[PDB]
A paper describes a structure:
First, the structure of CgnE was determined to 2.0 Å. The leader peptide is enriched with positively charged amino acids, and both CgnB and CgnE show a large, strongly negatively charged patch near the possible binding site. We found the binding of CgnE to the CgnALP to be almost 300 times weaker than binding to CgnA (KD = 514 µM). CgnE appears to recruit the substrate peptide CgnA to CgnC and assist in catalysis, perhaps by presenting the core peptide in a specific conformation or by ensuring appropriate timing of the hydroxylation reactions, but does not seem to possess catalytic activity itself.
Here we use in vitro experiments to demonstrate that three proteins, CgnB, CgnC and CgnE, are sufficient for the production of the hallmark tetracyclic crocagin core from the precursor peptide CgnA. We further show that the hydrolase CgnD liberates the crocagin core scaffold, which is subsequently N-methylated by CgnL. The crystal structures of the homologues CgnB and CgnE reveal them to be the founding members of a peptide-binding protein family and allow us to rationalize their distinct functions.
Residue numbers in the entry: 17 to 321
């Protein structure tokens, strides 16, 4: 089945919503959905009927990932626990998911991937800055399709963005250089340990980013300057990044393909922040460095053949 039909069934309350928290379940029930506890949903039996999985407790993220290639149901998920599991993020996140024009987003995403596959480089203009993303001959993408294949899981945000990833190597697909003034950032952690080591500092950066004057600069694919709230914080980030994963190397670049209806303000850690236009550049893998995306919501994009 198609992503477009999935989003249509979701807006029509035509599928169950699997939830791992009773308070979140009550919020989802108030929006008109049938809710099923996470431990109670039959993920095994083959089924053509889809479901949305909302994961608000970090303790269930390993179980969510374990559904990969095992689930009998077409699924998307909203893994709030990896970002910020609070109820306000659930309410706002669901408002955004139910408001976005997903058909237009899927068309823009298709066109963007074809551009990313046919370009030597991409220029991202944000204020006075220009970030250049040089794309290689073999382009790695997390997901360029429009369908939900059996056993695969997808974040609800996946079909609203077009992204290329340095999956195999530090620059197996692209490398970046230049400056990106940005509106805000988000950060994804796949474990409680990681979120505890990094969250205090990143939430402080998040707080300070609301005062604008945010800039990330890349040299030879690696951050060499980070400014948040007009304050250089490069050494803070480098201190925790030291010796982990690929340090401050760019791991992902992408374009937000959706409208901005009910989009949330920067300064909260919403997994939907990349989708509402512009472009973003990311570091980390979410394993020993959070996957951090610096987002320029109003950036303009030029593809170079």
């Amino acid at each position: 089945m198609n992503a477009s039909d999935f989003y249509a069934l979701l807006r029509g309350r035509g599928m169950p919503v699997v939830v791992d928290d009773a308070e979140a379940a009550a919020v989802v029930s108030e929006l008109g959905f049938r809710t099923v506890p996470f431990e109670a949903f039959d993920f095994d039996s083959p089924s053509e009927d889809p479901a949305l999985v909302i994961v608000a407790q970090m303790g269930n993220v390993d179980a969510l990932h374990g559904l990969w290639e095992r689930s009998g149901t077409p699924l998307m998920h909203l893994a709030l626990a990896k970002f910020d599991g609070g109820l306000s993020r659930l309410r706002a996140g669901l408002a955004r998911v139910l408001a976005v024009d997903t058909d237009a987003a899927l068309k823009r995403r298709a066109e963007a991937y074809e551009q990313l596959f046919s370009s030597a480089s991409v220029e991202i203009a944000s204020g006075e800055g220009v970030l250049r993303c040089h794309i290689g001959d073999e382009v790695e993408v997390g997901n360029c399709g429009d369908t939900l294949e059996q056993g695969f899981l997808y974040s609800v945000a996946e079909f609203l963005e077009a992204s290329v990833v340095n999956l195999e190597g530090e620059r197996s697909t692209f490398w970046v250089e230049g400056e990106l003034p940005f509106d805000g950032f988000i950060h994804l952690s796949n474990s409680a340990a990681l979120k505890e080591r990094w969250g205090g500092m990143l939430d402080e950066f998040m707080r300070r980013s609301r005062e604008g004057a945010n800039l990330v600069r890349f040299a030879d694919n690696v951050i060499d300057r980070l400014v948040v709230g007009g304050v250089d914080v490069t050494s803070a980030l480098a201190g925790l990044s030291q010796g982990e994963e690929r340090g401050m190397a760019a791991t992902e670049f992408g374009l937000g393909c959706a409208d901005a209806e009910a989009a949330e303000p920067f300064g909260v850690n919403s997994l939907l922040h990349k989708s509402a236009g512009g472009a973003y550049i990311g570091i980390g893998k979410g394993l020993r460095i959070p996957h951090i995306d610096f987002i320029a919501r109003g950036a303009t994009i030029r593809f170079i053949p």
